[PDB]
Amino acid sequence: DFQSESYKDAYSRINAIVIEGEQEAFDNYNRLAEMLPDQRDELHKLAKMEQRHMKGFMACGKNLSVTPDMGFAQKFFERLHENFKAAAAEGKVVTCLLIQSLIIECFAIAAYNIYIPVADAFARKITEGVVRDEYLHRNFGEEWLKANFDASKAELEEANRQNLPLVWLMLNEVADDARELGMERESLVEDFMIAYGEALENIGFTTREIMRMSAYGLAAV
Ligand SMILES: CCCCCCCCCCCCCCCCO
Ligand SMILES: [Fe+2]
Ligand SMILES: [Fe+2]
């Protein structure tokens, strides 16, 4: 029942959170575009994709006659967003890449795919389209970081350590509203640990290293 006051209420926060992610992602990729001149056009492309996602999700909100609680969503993203900004200012492209392209993208992939089977038919269509783009964004980050892994390794570990716990906290924060929308926490935690562990394996981390990196997240709750 997409019309109930309890579905509308949870949707107000989830829709707003998703919209903030897409909008925030737009700025992250534009900022990366400055920091990685060799990848400037490509990163600009990924930015414009995020813009379209934002519009797509604003339209999912209107379809269910829900005003997004943007204030709640700004606060949801705040810590992780300020960490990205500070990294950009420091010239730390690797940290900015791991945040947005790996931690974050992955997060949207796991949650979005879980949302698809329980989503109203308008939003299901919008979401199927956005998730397709997300695979690309994650692949871009994996490809760059695997190509530059030795130079990048130590900063990735450090960035993972500061930022993965922020995503776990975001995960806990959304859990109850997500359930109302028909999305189980257990699937979301699992699909995220899997997606991010595989991304870490794919760029070059060992079993012990992935366990260490993953554990910084799981331990924060
Ligand atoms: C209406 C969308 C339903 C899915 C909501 C997922 C719950 C919280 C995850 C939000 C993650 C936002 C990340 C967007 C980043 C874009 O590249
Ligand atoms: Fe996106
Ligand atoms: Fe994205």
Author numbering: 11 to 231
Q: What does the literature reporting this entry say, word for word?
A:
Cyanobacterial aldehyde-deformylating oxygenase (cADO), which catalyzes the conversion of Cn fatty aldehyde to its corresponding Cn-1 alk(a/e)ne, is a key enzyme in that pathway. SeADO belongs to the di-iron protein family, with conserved sequence of two EX28-29EX2H motifs, in which six conservative amino acids from four helices (Glu32 from helix H1, Glu115 from helix H4, Glu60 & His63 from helix H2, and Glu144 & His147 from helix H5) act as metal ligands.
Following the analysis of the extracts together with the observed electron densities, we built a long-chain fatty acid (Lox) into the structure of WT-HP, and a long-chain fatty alcohol (Lred) into three other structures. On the basis of these observations, we propose that the Lred ligand may represent the real substrate, namely fatty aldehyde, because of the similarity in their chemical structures. In the WT1 structure, a Lred ligand, which was proposed to mimic the substrate aldehyde, was modeled in the substrate channel according to the electron density. The ligand approaches the di-iron cluster from the opposite side of His147, with its head-group binding directly to the Fe2 atom. This coordination mode suggests that Fe2 is the preferred iron for substrate binding. The water molecule, located near the di-iron site in the Y122F structure, is displaced by the head group of the Lred ligand. The residue Glu144, which is located in helix H5, changes its rotamer and is not coordinated with either iron atoms. In addition, E115 alters its mode of Fe2 coordination, from bidentate to monodentate, while other four iron-coordinating residues stay unchanged, resulting in a distorted tetrahedral coordination of both Fe1 and Fe2. The structural comparison between WT1 and Y122F implied that the swing of Glu144 might be induced by ligand binding, thus enabled us to visualize the conformational change coupled with substrate binding in cADO active site for the first time.
